Design an enzyme around this catalytic site. Structure first.
Site, short mmCIF file in Angstrom:
data_model
loop_
_atom_site.label_atom_id
_atom_site.label_comp_id
_atom_site.label_asym_id
_atom_site.label_seq_id
_atom_site.Cartn_x
_atom_site.Cartn_y
_atom_site.Cartn_z
N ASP A 77 1.21 -1.52 0.01
CA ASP A 77 0.17 0.01 -0.15
C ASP A 77 1.08 1.46 0.17
O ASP A 77 2.13 1.54 0.79
CB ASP A 77 -1.32 -0.21 1.09
CG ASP A 77 -1.54 1.53 1.22
OD1 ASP A 77 -1.33 2.55 1.18
OD2 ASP A 77 -2.96 1.08 1.44
N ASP A 168 -2.59 2.30 -5.65
CA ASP A 168 -1.93 2.49 -4.49
C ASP A 168 -1.66 1.15 -3.89
O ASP A 168 -0.71 0.48 -3.31
CB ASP A 168 -2.31 3.42 -2.96
CG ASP A 168 -2.49 2.73 -1.98
OD1 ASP A 168 -3.64 2.56 -2.36
OD2 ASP A 168 -1.23 3.49 -1.54
N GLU A 169 -2.03 0.01 -4.28
CA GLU A 169 -2.67 -1.56 -3.74
C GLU A 169 -1.81 -2.29 -3.87
O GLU A 169 -2.77 -2.58 -5.33
CB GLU A 169 -4.24 -0.90 -2.86
CG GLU A 169 -4.09 -2.41 -1.75
CD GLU A 169 -5.51 -1.31 -0.50
OE1 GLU A 169 -5.59 -0.17 -0.56
OE2 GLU A 169 -6.22 -1.64 -0.72
N1 LIG Z 1 -12.21 7.83 -0.31
C1 LIG Z 1 -11.33 8.17 -0.82
C2 LIG Z 1 -9.90 6.95 -0.65
C3 LIG Z 1 -9.06 7.33 -1.01
N2 LIG Z 1 -9.08 7.67 -2.10
C4 LIG Z 1 -7.48 8.31 -3.17
C5 LIG Z 1 -6.35 8.25 -1.76
C6 LIG Z 1 -5.34 7.99 -1.95
O1 LIG Z 1 -4.31 8.20 -2.03
C7 LIG Z 1 -5.57 6.81 -3.20
C8 LIG Z 1 -4.99 5.42 -2.31
O2 LIG Z 1 -6.14 5.14 -0.99
P1 LIG Z 1 -5.19 4.73 0.36
O3 LIG Z 1 -4.46 3.63 0.55
O4 LIG Z 1 -6.36 4.09 1.39
N3 LIG Z 1 -4.61 5.90 1.59
P2 LIG Z 1 -3.41 6.82 1.05
O5 LIG Z 1 -2.50 6.43 0.26
O6 LIG Z 1 -3.29 8.47 0.83
O7 LIG Z 1 -2.49 6.56 2.31
P3 LIG Z 1 -2.33 5.60 3.37
O8 LIG Z 1 -3.89 5.22 4.23
O9 LIG Z 1 -1.23 4.37 2.18
O10 LIG Z 1 -0.82 5.46 4.47
O11 LIG Z 1 -6.69 6.25 -2.84
C9 LIG Z 1 -10.19 8.64 -3.02
O12 LIG Z 1 -10.15 9.58 -3.96
N4 LIG Z 1 -10.90 8.95 -1.93
MG LIG Z 2 -2.16 4.46 0.91
#
Ligand SMILES: Nc1ccn([C@H]2C[C@H](O)[C@@H](COP(=O)(O)NP(=O)(O)OP(=O)(O)O)O2)c(=O)n1
Ligand SMILES: [Mg+2]
Length: 431
Positions: A77, A168-169
DNA sequence: GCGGATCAG
DNA sequence: ATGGCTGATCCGC
């Protein structure tokens, strides 16, 4: 800012809103569904609870016997993904709080900005209350897609049949690679610094490789989880975040040591509502979920308590089943109020076209068109229709959606529908 | 098969 | 002033 100080400022800015009103109306619909479950608990005898306990424990003994610790599962992630990219390509943002999104809504926020309580799926204007010093940067989705392509290239080395959950995952099965890696020379697992470095033959090391190579190639950090099944990997992936790993060693005890005190909320699948429902039975951790497994077989449906039990015993998926064929495709959009009906049709027609062009891309055609309407007080309706003939063009979709939309406008006549959002989905693809 | 809801990122 | 998107699934009917 203090946890008490945060929930207050939101309540200050949020209270009175149309949106807020709907959140209460939902929280009431929730609490009612809680109270009903309780009125159903009360009418359970000790005899039924016993009859259940043996039924569950016969199943649990089947699951425990089928347990499998022989696979190594990695979950990657990316850390503050969209924010980190924007930070990467603008040094001025590095030591400072930011959020990716608009004033209407935020995708994410860097860790500097979370310390003020701003997070994903929070509107921008509220985050500016929680931190006026906040820089909101518009999302550059194309960059994020490109970065994702750079990391998926790395991940292909270790599992070519890896599956990605978003940009991201991604889950990986590194069993076939760890096997091959035991008897590899140091030349095949050396990587030069962007001076040279070599990484070990262990699971902890393979993942340190992956995380290293990613930081070289993208100048971005990722966290990881290592465990014998996906569900578990996914949980520990978030444990030492950011920029850190965690392994659950492949032995029954270590699994159970972790599960023991793990809140149910930290599991993928248990959201806010389910948390509150299980909290109403005194279930907060995963051993409490095990204890009440009989009670849970009578209150929840077969698929739900089956799932809850897998979680209770720390089980999950151990092979990554290839991404199957899609079952729907959709498009929706928010806007400032629309009440003039002719505009609502014209919009429907535009969404229908977009959706048609998306199907064209993947050469798919479907039988069930579904509109989605959200009014200015945030109440959502969906309306569907299934047709004998398979449909696909912009016209055919619009043909079907037009009528569904009509039925709704006519229903409130003489009142106009005051919409803030409309959508169109197609579904029911072939066998 | 429908509509309302939850959940994910 | 400004409260997002897409896709999957489940529960009850
Ligand atoms: N409700 C959401 C959740 C995430 N996203 C997008 C933004 C995030 O950068 C990306 C990946 O989400 P994520 O892995 O859960 N968290 P993020 O990468 O921001 O940070 P970390 O949780 O890994 O520290 O999806 C979105 O557009 N709407
Ligand atoms: Mg993330």
């Amino acid at each position: 800012l203090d946890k008490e100080k945060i929930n207050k400022i939101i309540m200050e800015a949020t209270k009175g809103s149309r949106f807020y009103g709907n959140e209460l109306k939902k929280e009431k619909q929730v609490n009612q569904r809680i109270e009903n479950m309780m009125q159903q608990k009360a009418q359970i005898t000790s005899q039924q609870l016993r009859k259940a306990q043996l039924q569950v424990d016969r199943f649990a003994m089947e699951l425990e016997q089928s347990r499998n610790l022989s696979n190594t599962i990695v979950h990657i992630d990316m850390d503050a993904f969209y924010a980190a990219v924007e930070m990467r390509d603008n040094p001025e943002l590095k030591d400072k709080p930011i959020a990716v999104g608009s004033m209407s809504m935020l995708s994410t926020s860097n860790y500097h900005a979370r310390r003020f309580g701003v997070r994903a799926a929070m509107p921008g204007f509220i985050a500016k209350r929680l931190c006026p010093q906040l820089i909101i940067v518009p999302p550059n989705f194309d960059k994020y897609r490109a970065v994702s392509k750079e990391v998926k290239e790395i991940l292909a080395d270790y599992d070519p049949n890896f599956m990605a959950m978003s940009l991201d995952e991604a889950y990986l099965n590194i069993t076939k690679h760890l096997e091959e890696r035991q008897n590899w020379p140091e030349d095949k697992r050396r990587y030069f610094i962007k001076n040279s470095v070599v990484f070990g033959t262990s699971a902890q090391e393979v993942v340190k490789e992956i995380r290293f190579r990613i930081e070289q190639k993208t100048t971005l950090t990722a966290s990881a989880g290592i465990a014998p099944n996906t569900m578990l990997a996914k949980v520990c992936s978030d444990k030492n975040k950011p920029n850190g790993q965690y392994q659950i060693l492949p032995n029954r005890q270590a699994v159970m040591d972790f599960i023991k005190d793990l809140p149910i909320r930290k599991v993928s699948g248990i959201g806010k509502v389910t948390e509150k429902m299980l909290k109403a039975l005194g279930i907060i951790t995963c051993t409490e979920l095990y204890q009440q497994r009989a009670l849970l077989s009578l209150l929840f449906s077969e698929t739900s308590w089956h799932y809850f039990l897998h979680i209770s015993l720390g089980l999950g998926s151990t092979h990554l089943t290839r991404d199957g064929e899609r079952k729907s495709m959709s498009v929706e959009r928010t806007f400032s109020e629309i009440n003039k009906a002719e505009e609502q049709y014209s919009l429907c027609q535009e969404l229908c076209s977009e959706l048609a062009q998306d199907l064209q891309k993947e050469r798919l055609k479907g039988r069930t068109v579904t509109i989605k309407l959200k009014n200015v007080n945030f109440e959502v309706k969906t309306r569907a229709s299934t047709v004998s003939s398979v449909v696909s063009t912009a016209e055919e979709i619009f043909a079907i959606a037009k009528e569904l939309l009509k039925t709704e406008i006519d229903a409130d006549f003489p009142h106009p529908l005051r919409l803030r959002l409309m959508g169109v989905r197609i579904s029911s693809f072939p066998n």
